[PDB]
Structure formats: structure tokens, C-alpha cells
């Protein structure tokens, strides 16, 4: 295997991540395994978000993940929602949630 990404079994670019860690001035040096690890973590997080979003899309019987579906995936999952609590998502809308007192009797 030539490229470090395929050598690490990932899909995110280990090389691009290595460059961004170098010309980002986070430290004088960047260990060999740091880009591998960081790209693996990025890949896992984006795989989780895309999985949940795809499910949210399959719910509404659509085929394309629009931003609405990313918002539903993020908000409707406690751990992502804690990771992305201070994050507006353009066109995201809001979770459909009427307060329990406002509904008529």
C-alpha cells in the first residue's frame, strides 16, 4: 500500500491531516502516529453522524441527507448533542417539540 490512509485502513487522508497539524502551529513536531490517530477519530465521528443522519432520512422516506436530517441526527442523540451543543447548523430547523402544558385538554 502506497498512501498512508490505505495503510492505516482509514478513509480520511492521513497525509492531509499531517499537513494540517504541521502548518497549523500546534507544536514544533508531530509524531508519526498522531495523524493516523486523529484521522481515525475524525472518520469515526463523521461515520457516526452520517449513520444517524441516514437513518433520519430513511425515516422520512427520502434518499438525500439534507441539513434537516443532520440536525435531527445530532439533536436526537444525547452524546452528539452534548458534543455539538454550542453549534448552530444552517437550515437546521429545530426538533419538533411542543411543551407539555400548551396542548389543549
Amino acid at each position: 500500500a502506497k498512501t498512508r490512509s490505505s495503510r492505516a485502513g482509514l478513509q480520511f487522508p492521513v497525509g492531509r491531516v499531517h499537513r494540517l497539524l504541521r502548518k497549523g502551529n500546534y507544536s514544533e513536531r508531530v509524531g508519526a502516529g498522531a495523524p493516523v490517530y486523529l484521522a481515525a477519530v475524525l472518520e469515526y465521528l463523521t461515520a457516526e453522524i452520517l449513520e444517524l443522519a441516514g437513518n433520519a432520512a430513511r425515516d422520512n422516506k427520502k434518499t438525500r441527507i439534507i441539513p434537516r436530517h443532520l440536525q435531527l441526527a445530532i439533536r436526537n442523540d444525547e452524546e452528539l448533542n452534548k458534543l455539538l451543543g454550542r453549534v448552530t447548523i444552517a437550515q437546521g430547523g429545530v426538533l419538533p417539540n411542543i411543551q407539555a402544558v400548551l396542548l389543549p385538554k
Binding site: 480520511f12 492531509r16 491531516v17 509524531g31 477519530v41 472518520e43 465521528l45 457516526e48 452534548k82
Partner: protein
Amino acid sequence: SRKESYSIYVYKVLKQVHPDTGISSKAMGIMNSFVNDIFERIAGEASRLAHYNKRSTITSREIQTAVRLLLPGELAKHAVSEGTKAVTKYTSA
């Protein structure tokens, strides 16, 4: 004549997870910004961890404890598992 992004890598991950679900353009912009956000967060935390210890290099140890500091519980555990798995494989053979 180039512009960097993750617009194709996120698409590969998608096709690997949901083999038949496309992703819109604005949603691709969102994911492309989410990856950048998490990258800057984990990298900034690893930089803080490099200075707080008077180290100089961002090893994998630094990225690991940075992932433990940022992501909440089960995301942290799974992300650390994936990271160590990818690192170990890279070290192997």
C-alpha cells in the same frame, strides 16, 4: 489552483455506511465544517497538552487524551478504540 476540503472523504465514509444514500450540497458543507471543527478542537487540546507537560511533539498519546477530554462518554470510548486500532495496524507489518 486548488482548494482543500473533505468533500470526497465524507462521501466515501457515507458510501461505506449507507451504501445507497446520497448527500446534498449544503449537507456536505455542514459535514465539511464539522470535520474542521472537531479537528481544530482535538488539535488545540493536544497542543495545550503538549505545553502543559513541557513536551514538544504531538504524539498519539496527546491526541488520545485529547479525544478523552473532548468527546463525551461512549463516543470517547469508541473513538479511542478506533484510534488505537488504526494506529496499531499502521505500526504493524
